[PDB]
Design a protein around this nucleic acid. Structure first.
Lengths: 112, 68, 227
RNA sequence: CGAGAUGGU
RNA sequence: AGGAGUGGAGCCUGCGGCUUAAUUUGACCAACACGGGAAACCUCACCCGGCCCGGACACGGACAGGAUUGACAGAUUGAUAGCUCUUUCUCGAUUCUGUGGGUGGUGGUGCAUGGCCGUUCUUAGUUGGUGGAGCGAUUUGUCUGGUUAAUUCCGAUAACGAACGAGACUCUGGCAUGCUAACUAGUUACGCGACCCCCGAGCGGUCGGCGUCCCCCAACUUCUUAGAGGGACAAGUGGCGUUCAGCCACCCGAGAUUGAGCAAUAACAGGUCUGUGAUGCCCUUAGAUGUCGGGGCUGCACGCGCGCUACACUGACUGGCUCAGCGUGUGCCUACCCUACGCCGGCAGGCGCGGGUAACCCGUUGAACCCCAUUCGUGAUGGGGAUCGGGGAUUGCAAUUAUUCCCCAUGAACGAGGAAUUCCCAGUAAGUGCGGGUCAUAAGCUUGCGUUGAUUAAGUCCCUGCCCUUUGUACACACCGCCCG
């Protein structure tokens, strides 16, 4: 279907971010966050909605696939040690982020 | 355009002249009849091309040597 | 048939009949070495002639399978009782038939023999049988999860122009192993045979041949000879 | 002898 | 160098975005009138509801005062689904029930595969054996030059002798008063026969003219069909060529390039699991991801692609005259075909009654542009025909979100199109209409056929690309590369 970059490289399998994108909520050890700044080297600064800011890292599965950006909404996994640091699990589209807030899942802080 | 003759024509014409020089001459319409009885040629259109180069070679052999 | 059908429909329907009969026999007689069917008509009677390498398997213990096959051919195609007869016939020069070589390679692979040992096994037997050349191909998941192919070739092989319709014999087949399907393709190039039915009677279009001159005397002197 | 940088799948 | 354009207008149709219960989905030069994809139902995969087993077989249980099957009426229901509820007849070992195991799926993965197709790539390219050269990856053969549409030929030569592609080959177009021979094809002629005209030397005639008017137990194969052979070779003459291989002009001739099919080695994470009883693994399997009723695929601020009709006088309208070629036709489950002639109606259409399983009947296939005469008069006009009101037929089980067709009325933008950009060299481009596919109903698409018939070239490497050789490199994921502060 429609490309949205432009290049020779048709050598991959297509992204298909479609159909049964079943909505995901927290388990134990997770938080929702908004991206505040993006740094070099595959890392970023993020704020979760109960107010603890963290330095955050892209998991190896999301490399060069799920492009994160400033003010974007993400799902983050906490560590049982080293509480200043965490890893990204998912990105929510602006269509999914409004459904989280419609289920009352997010405080009235997140931008959409 | 292009009227160059392929090796299938040029080799068959040489082998005919080596064996049957005493039968041949300058008349294309007589050479065309001789080449039909001394050889098996699958096509009428190939027979005409072989008798054509045989007729060209007879007119050369009347002047001097041909190396093949 | 209360009024006869038109010739366009008649000639197409006779071809559709031969196609379905060949498919039924292909999958019934696969291990029994089938290679073709021929059908002929005479007043009140149709005779079907069937070619195989092991004709006793086509008959069975006292002719049971010929009687069972006669019954189902009559039952399915709507012939009246007793108007159908089946005759089994033995294949001549079975190394020069592409379908019998594609099936015997399929059963040799299905028994677990290694791919290169099997493929050079048929390549030798075709060239010892007197073909001018051949080409055997196998493709699919040969050794690993990513697909591959192998070509095995010997002698002469043409690809273009009209002579391909009578100098080359070809078959294609499938074999199912525990990891998925493999393909087999077989091609054989036939010898020229002026009369004898090993191969075609018509020569290749660019094979000119010259008759040899004989028995002349160079010297002469004038003489007369009366009867 | 005009101007002609750059590179997720 | 030029021709017809496309991009600008209205409408048709495919795609994105938005909207929605759903607007099912693949594909981004080599996607977008493409999936033979013209969806009323079916197709059908999507959305809202409801019946059904079409759960083999094995083991255990239950069971001939009986395992199980089917149903009237009232309530219920979109419903004449005994689906379910109340009631009480009916069938007869075929089922039911628990466990194990199967079976089906237009479900998922084309980045697990087969088969098929497209593309690199329409160009001239590709490879062993024995011998020679290098420690080696590799190389020569497969070439300095000339010639050709061509790795086509000549020739040269540490290589010799071969294989595939090219070409040959198959179908097709143009010629035969020569051959074979025709009541499912014609001509000529007459025994003649018949209607009409005197225009004709001359009468109303033997004799003339006109005929798809009619017999032949006449003669024949020019015109039609289609089998066998024939014919063209750079063969002849003049120039140019390391005088070879070839190239240019001209005579004679139906004809001195007719147009297609088939096509190598090695590749691509190209497309297809939605063509298949081709297929691995995964998922689902009785409150089903295996049948009926209704809805959607057509939804509309907006961006893009292939097309149809036009902006008029080299025209539009109303009469009159006169010429094609390629095809299809009573459906074998599956239930329908092509039509002459007569009658009723302005029209679309209706009734009756015949021929055709087809060189036999529709049919001498009375095609359109074109041709001859008339009206309008430079006016958004008698150019253009979008949009919209009212009425009548035909298909179908059903036409509203208008199936298609006919009639009166209404009368938009548009006056030859900005930056850009496509296709084409002769019976070709463009104009013009007719068959086939899909089809119960129906082309603004596509695949074939005939008819009218030009302007400009006979060249080049400039732009975009392809082939071969020499050359440089920090590239090999191969310039859409690599890399510095």
């Amino acid at each position: 279907n429609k490309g949205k970059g432009g290049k020779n490289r048709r050598r991959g399998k297509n992204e298909n971010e479609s159909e049964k994108r079943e909505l995901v909520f927290k388990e134990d050890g997770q938080e929702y966050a908004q991206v505040i700044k993006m740094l070099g080297n595959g890392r970023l600064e993020a704020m979760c909605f109960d107010g603890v800011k963290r330095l955050c890292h892209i998991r190896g599965k999301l490399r060069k696939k799920v492009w994160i950006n400033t003010s974007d909404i993400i799902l983050v996994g906490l560590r049982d040690y080293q509480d200043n640091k965490a890893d990204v699990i998912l990105k929510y589209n602006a269509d999914e982020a409004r459904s989280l807030k419609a289920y009352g899942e997010l405080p009235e802080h997140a931008k959409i | 355009m292009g009227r160059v003759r392929t090796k299938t024509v040029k080799k068959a014409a040489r082998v005919i002249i080596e064996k049957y020089y005493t039968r041949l001459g300058n008349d294309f319409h007589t050479n065309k009849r001789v080449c039909e009885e001394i050889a098996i040629i699958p096509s009428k259109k190939l027979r005409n091309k072989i008798a054509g180069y045989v007729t060209h070679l007879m007119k050369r052999i009347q002047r001097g040597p041909v190396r093949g | 048939m209360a009024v006869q059908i038109s010739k366009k429909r008649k000639f197409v329907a006779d071809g559709i009949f031969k196609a379905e009969l060949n498919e039924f026999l292909t999958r019934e007689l696969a291990e029994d070495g089938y290679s073709g069917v021929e059908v002929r008509v005479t007043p009140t009677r149709t005779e079907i002639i069937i070619l195989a390498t092991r004709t006793q398997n086509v008959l069975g213990e006292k002719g049971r399978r010929i009687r069972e096959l006669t019954a189902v051919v009559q039952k399915r195609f709507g012939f009246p009782e007793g108007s159908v007869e089946l005759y089994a016939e033995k294949v001549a020069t079975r190394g020069l038939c592409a379908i019998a070589q594609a099936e015997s390679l399929r059963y040799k692979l299905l028994g677990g023999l290694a791919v290169r040992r099997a493929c050079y096994g048929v390549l030798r037997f075709i060239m010892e049988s007197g073909a001018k050349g051949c080409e055997v191909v196998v493709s699919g998941k040969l050794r690993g999860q990513r697909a591959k192919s192998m070509k095995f070739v010997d002698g002469l092989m043409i690809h273009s122009g009209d002579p391909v319709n009578y100098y080359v014999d070809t078959a294609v087949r499938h074999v199912l192993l525990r990891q998925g399907v493999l393909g087999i393709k077989v091609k054989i190039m036939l010898p020229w045979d002026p009369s004898g039915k090993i191969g075609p009677k018509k020569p290749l279009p660019d094979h000119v041949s010259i008759v040899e001159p004989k028995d002349e005397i160079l010297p002469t002197t004038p003489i007369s000879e009366q009867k």
